[PDB]
PDB file of C-alpha atoms in Angstrom:
ATOM      1  CA  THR A   1      -5.636   5.271 -15.053  1.00  0.00           C
ATOM      2  CA  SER A   2      -7.218   6.538 -12.249  1.00  0.00           C
ATOM      3  CA  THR A   3      -5.065   7.350  -9.720  1.00  0.00           C
ATOM      4  CA  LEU A   4      -6.925   4.346  -7.279  1.00  0.00           C
ATOM      5  CA  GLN A   5      -6.496   2.133  -9.616  1.00  0.00           C
ATOM      6  CA  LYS A   6      -2.226   2.427 -10.275  1.00  0.00           C
ATOM      7  CA  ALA A   7      -2.122   2.647  -5.750  1.00  0.00           C
ATOM      8  CA  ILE A   8      -4.078  -1.030  -6.663  1.00  0.00           C
ATOM      9  CA  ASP A   9      -1.868  -1.708  -9.031  1.00  0.00           C
ATOM     10  CA  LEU A  10       1.417  -0.820  -7.070  1.00  0.00           C
ATOM     11  CA  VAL A  11      -0.037  -2.109  -3.812  1.00  0.00           C
ATOM     12  CA  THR A  12      -0.488  -5.982  -5.433  1.00  0.00           C
ATOM     13  CA  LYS A  13       2.812  -6.039  -7.005  1.00  0.00           C
ATOM     14  CA  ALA A  14       4.507  -4.632  -3.280  1.00  0.00           C
ATOM     15  CA  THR A  15       2.504  -7.986  -1.748  1.00  0.00           C
ATOM     16  CA  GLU A  16       3.862  -9.573  -4.286  1.00  0.00           C
ATOM     17  CA  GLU A  17       7.314  -9.088  -4.368  1.00  0.00           C
ATOM     18  CA  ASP A  18       6.852  -8.878  -0.267  1.00  0.00           C
ATOM     19  CA  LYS A  19       5.545 -13.022  -0.257  1.00  0.00           C
ATOM     20  CA  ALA A  20       9.220 -13.051  -2.909  1.00  0.00           C
ATOM     21  CA  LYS A  21      10.838 -11.857   0.211  1.00  0.00           C
ATOM     22  CA  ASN A  22      11.509  -7.998  -1.778  1.00  0.00           C
ATOM     23  CA  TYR A  23      11.095  -5.938   1.380  1.00  0.00           C
ATOM     24  CA  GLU A  24      13.460  -3.450  -0.211  1.00  0.00           C
ATOM     25  CA  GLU A  25      10.802  -3.602  -3.507  1.00  0.00           C
ATOM     26  CA  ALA A  26       7.458  -4.656  -1.510  1.00  0.00           C
ATOM     27  CA  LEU A  27       8.470  -1.445   0.814  1.00  0.00           C
ATOM     28  CA  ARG A  28       8.796   0.921  -2.145  1.00  0.00           C
ATOM     29  CA  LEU A  29       5.445  -0.394  -3.776  1.00  0.00           C
ATOM     30  CA  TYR A  30       3.737   0.064  -0.881  1.00  0.00           C
ATOM     31  CA  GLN A  31       5.097   3.744  -0.072  1.00  0.00           C
ATOM     32  CA  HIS A  32       3.941   4.649  -3.174  1.00  0.00           C
ATOM     33  CA  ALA A  33       0.321   2.547  -3.395  1.00  0.00           C
ATOM     34  CA  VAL A  34      -0.242   4.726  -0.401  1.00  0.00           C
ATOM     35  CA  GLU A  35       0.310   8.016  -1.786  1.00  0.00           C
ATOM     36  CA  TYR A  36      -1.485   7.392  -4.579  1.00  0.00           C
ATOM     37  CA  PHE A  37      -4.702   6.012  -2.622  1.00  0.00           C
ATOM     38  CA  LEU A  38      -4.389   9.819  -0.646  1.00  0.00           C
ATOM     39  CA  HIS A  39      -4.025  11.056  -2.782  1.00  0.00           C
ATOM     40  CA  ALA A  40      -7.233   9.878  -4.567  1.00  0.00           C
ATOM     41  CA  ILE A  41      -9.809  10.623  -1.250  1.00  0.00           C
ATOM     42  CA  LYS A  42      -8.757  14.042  -2.022  1.00  0.00           C
ATOM     43  CA  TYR A  43      -8.424  14.525  -5.382  1.00  0.00           C
ATOM     44  CA  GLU A  44     -10.910  12.521  -6.418  1.00  0.00           C
ATOM     45  CA  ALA A  45     -14.431  11.446  -5.214  1.00  0.00           C
ATOM     46  CA  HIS A  46     -15.912   9.676  -3.505  1.00  0.00           C
ATOM     47  CA  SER A  47     -18.295   8.105  -0.452  1.00  0.00           C
ATOM     48  CA  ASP A  48     -18.195   8.274   3.092  1.00  0.00           C
ATOM     49  CA  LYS A  49     -17.382   4.109   3.759  1.00  0.00           C
ATOM     50  CA  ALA A  50     -15.479   4.417   0.728  1.00  0.00           C
ATOM     51  CA  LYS A  51     -13.087   7.478   2.140  1.00  0.00           C
ATOM     52  CA  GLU A  52     -12.985   4.669   5.347  1.00  0.00           C
ATOM     53  CA  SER A  53     -11.490   2.041   3.511  1.00  0.00           C
ATOM     54  CA  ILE A  54      -8.873   3.393   1.764  1.00  0.00           C
ATOM     55  CA  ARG A  55      -8.236   5.701   5.118  1.00  0.00           C
ATOM     56  CA  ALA A  56      -7.684   2.356   6.510  1.00  0.00           C
ATOM     57  CA  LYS A  57      -6.003   0.443   4.353  1.00  0.00           C
ATOM     58  CA  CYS A  58      -3.755   3.663   3.211  1.00  0.00           C
ATOM     59  CA  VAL A  59      -2.684   3.424   6.999  1.00  0.00           C
ATOM     60  CA  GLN A  60      -2.395  -0.855   6.876  1.00  0.00           C
ATOM     61  CA  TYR A  61      -0.207  -0.174   3.973  1.00  0.00           C
ATOM     62  CA  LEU A  62       1.905   1.551   5.535  1.00  0.00           C
ATOM     63  CA  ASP A  63       2.478   0.532   9.067  1.00  0.00           C
ATOM     64  CA  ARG A  64       3.884  -2.848   7.181  1.00  0.00           C
ATOM     65  CA  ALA A  65       6.400  -0.018   5.087  1.00  0.00           C
ATOM     66  CA  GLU A  66       6.541   1.420   8.988  1.00  0.00           C
ATOM     67  CA  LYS A  67       8.385  -2.238  10.065  1.00  0.00           C
ATOM     68  CA  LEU A  68       9.689  -3.233   6.924  1.00  0.00           C
ATOM     69  CA  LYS A  69      12.118  -0.400   7.077  1.00  0.00           C
ATOM     70  CA  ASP A  70      12.708  -0.423  10.819  1.00  0.00           C
ATOM     71  CA  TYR A  71      14.173  -3.992  10.808  1.00  0.00           C
ATOM     72  CA  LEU A  72      15.845  -3.341   7.199  1.00  0.00           C
ATOM     73  CA  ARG A  73      17.617  -0.112   8.376  1.00  0.00           C
TER      74      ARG A  73
ATOM     75  CA  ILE B   1     -14.470  -0.895  -4.359  1.00  0.00           C
ATOM     76  CA  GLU B   2     -12.486  -3.887  -3.393  1.00  0.00           C
ATOM     77  CA  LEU B   3      -9.121  -3.221  -2.104  1.00  0.00           C
ATOM     78  CA  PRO B   4      -5.986  -5.860  -1.414  1.00  0.00           C
ATOM     79  CA  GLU B   5      -4.952  -7.132   1.881  1.00  0.00           C
ATOM     80  CA  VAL B   6      -1.008  -7.055   2.175  1.00  0.00           C
ATOM     81  CA  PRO B   7       0.445 -10.588   3.242  1.00  0.00           C
ATOM     82  CA  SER B   8       0.636 -11.457   6.930  1.00  0.00           C
ATOM     83  CA  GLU B   9       4.793 -12.765   6.764  1.00  0.00           C
ATOM     84  CA  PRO B  10       6.206 -14.584   8.940  1.00  0.00           C
ATOM     85  CA  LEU B  11       9.719 -11.350   8.582  1.00  0.00           C
ATOM     86  CA  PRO B  12      11.223 -10.059  11.489  1.00  0.00           C
TER      87      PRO B  12
END
């Protein structure tokens, strides 16, 4: 499985968990998804628009993970 | 490239 594919897979579930009110599970997946995303742009080659997309979504996923862990703690 | 959008829930 491609690194990016895994990133999407992990994030996808993360969103489902967030809806299920699983901030903890969602948070873990969010951090993981981002990791794979960053690894894809670095270890994998992609157009500029692609990188920007990952960098944009990446900051979005993390931000969510941050606030999630913020109030959770 | 098609990515998902985080769910905007009404959480703290």
